[PDB]
Symmetry: D2
Subunit: 253 residues, 4 copies
């Protein structure tokens, strides 16, 4: 029987996903990391936090492959205690809604919304079949402030994320008797790899107070929030949405 809880972090080898994986490992979780390709240096780095880490190749959009991925995780770890739905993408192209291509809408919906929904389904079947439950359990979905704030130049992104908000509410109800805490986390403007030109612009916007807290969010901010929710103290808060955005999404006049 497992002695550490197991977190499956989709898209966990870079960016926000990696910040989440690091926070969870530090809190005492073992880690199943998925992505289209691995990074062995990152897996090694995560093992340095003192737990077990394994990588599983998965395309989130390829829903026919999800059950096999879940079985691989089960075969390696025995069970799943926390799912973090982090994998996602931005819009393929930004621009006028009038120029939005159905093909690009499809690509993002298939990843962010359809893929996440069915990956979650596959994991939940396994969680509901677990013959023992020794750790707090959770499903934490990383959507976006774009779930609730609209950006007309990228409505495909916004719609895909708003879909997740609705999904999470239903999922919370479905899993309430099983005592699996179901949460949404909405990141705002989180630091990414950037050119000086772009970073200087964002920094001026942030310092100007676009973000009330007047700083970049870090992957570690999202990570600490997620690890907080995964530790079990928020079980009775199932269905809650947390905005990891420095106050960006506060409606202000």
């Amino acid at each position: 029987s497992r002695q550490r809880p197991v977190a499956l972090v989709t898209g966990g080898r870079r960016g926000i996903g990696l910040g989440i994986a690091r926070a969870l490992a530090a809190k005492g979780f073992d880690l199943a990391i998925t992505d289209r390709e691995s990074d062995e240096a990152v897996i090694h780095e995560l093992r340095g936090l003192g737990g077990k880490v394994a990588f599983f190749k998965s395309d989130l959009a390829a829903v026919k492959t999800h059950e096999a991925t879940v079985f691989a995780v089960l075969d390696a770890f025995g069970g799943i205690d926390c799912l973090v739905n982090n994998a996602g993408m931005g819009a393929v192209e930004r621009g006028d809604f009038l120029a939005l291509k159905p093909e690009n809408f499809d690509t993002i919906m298939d990843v962010n919304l359809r893929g996440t929904v069915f990956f979650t389904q596959a994991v939940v079947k396994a969680m509901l079949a677990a013959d023992e439950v020794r750790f707090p359990r959770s499903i934490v979905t990383i959507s976006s402030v774009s779930s609730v704030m609209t950006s007309p130049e990228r409505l495909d992104y916004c719609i895909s994320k708003a879909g997740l908000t609705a999904f999470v509410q239903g999922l919370a109800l479905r899993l309430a008797e099983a005592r699996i805490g179901v949460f949404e986390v909405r990141p705002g403007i989180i630091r990414t790899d950037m050119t000086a030109k772009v970073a200087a612009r964002y920094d001026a916007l942030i310092e100007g107070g676009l973000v009330p807290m007047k700083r970049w969010g870090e992957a570690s901010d999202v990570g600490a929030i997620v690890a907080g929710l995964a530790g079990g103290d928020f079980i009775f808060a199932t269905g809650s949405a947390i905005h990891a955005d420095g106050g960006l999404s506060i409606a202000k006049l």
Copy 2:
């Protein structure tokens, strides 16, 4: 040069769409009705209200065909003043989220969400190219209370309608300078064709106070609301969402 405003009502041959069509005709609109299935009898009947009525055979999900449908509507009427996005479907199968099939999710998302988005895009291209704007203009999207209330046995439906909520907010911003009023109407429990068994069960629930107003919604309720929004008096309320549910979606304890 048209002397009456033109409303394009998708799915306008039956049910809520027909109620909306009747109400708009009574207010003085000409009507362009789309549906996948022909119904000349209903078109004939609508002509009794004194306006022009024309039918356009269209499958909402067939996005590659939308430009041609819009071109046909322009050829018949010269312009479009009001779009009512009413066409849609319920979930193919209701039941446990764990049994939800990707193919059924895709069917409903392709109709309710993808189809509506790209049909709207085709219409909006036409509207923004109009060389005369003599009438109030609007886009009224008929979503559902399921946009904001979850039903775990049909999350595909809820997700599709929540997506529309997000879309409507962005669309309202896109069209604000063009003075096209953009609204969401969320129907609740509206009378449909039903067996005595099912109708009796719903009547008991409605009378018990599931619906605070303790009556069925009628297609004419949704029609009267839409015709009010389409008349121009709500232009400055662009981005508003109207329940049409007898209070069903009021959150109460």
Copy 3:
């Protein structure tokens, strides 16, 4: 028996309230206008729209006086079909929350929230006692975009308006069986050179001032009966200001 529906518009002789009164009169309503002081010129202008108009002196904050006001309206008109809760005030002082004075918080809560709640109570007692219901009935409460958008320099105003939002939801449930449509209307930037530039610069997506007539047309739509099954709905009369955008 009355042959025209009766609308009671609080704060109805100036500004948004007067736009609402004008729209309702043009739609065929008789008008009971309240305010702290009359303007007989305005009352005369409203009579030009072809109905009955009467003024009733009332301080919205003086809740002990509300029943008498409602009786006066009933004595004049026989019944009330539409209440428009328009009367209100802005914050006494704007500035840092750290400097907010309890007495100023009290002034605005007593008017916008407490006064409205108990005036509504008085009117509703009368509506539920009516022996005839020949017209569509409604209660339309004019709150603000500040019900849902926060302004830290005037949190007393924001809190007062958010309170009304909660009140309207409850009221809608209370009155649903009686088929009294209950609605919230949230005005944005309604009609200066400073505001012009901000509006032109796109703070308001529609890029224009709201007019009292915008709010009036919306209210008159709701009061006409076609929105009865949409009870509990909120409409924002703000040119898109309150759409959450990034």
Copy 4:
């Protein structure tokens, strides 16, 4: 120069407040407890968790006394790192809105809304004047699911809590630059007769009573600093009760 952070928990002597105080002391906070009524036995027992505990007699509604209470807390502890606005009351009478008394509306608004706003103002003045910031800082306001779910038989309660929701949003903006995390926690049906049957019948999706320790665990999580970038968030501590379901 303090070596442990300080949490001021209003109404901390019993119920949810005591569950919050316990969770915070277990996480390493010193405690300033307020209540209108003393209970030295409870204070004594809290010291068993190993931190400093002090009591300050305070009536949340008595806003003229708040600066003195905060001065006393500063005299004892040197600063305040976490404020938990827990103190509050239910409606004096539950019943038809038509029977709601202004006197009762005033009592609850004075405690839950006005008292909380101005007690927070006093604490925030102290926080913003601090010469040292060695610990994560937060203001966690305990409202209710009634902030967003209406109950027509107690609209005074609902309105008071909705007013807090709006307050928290503005407060979060005001304090964001200062990196004080500002949060709302909305308790559902917490164990403090009909209800036990309703919970069984599925009203609460998780099908159990909430405990004061549920709310306490949530608050201690928020107070620990890891949620600083989530300022403005609302957490519903209700077993899924407020999820809008059809």
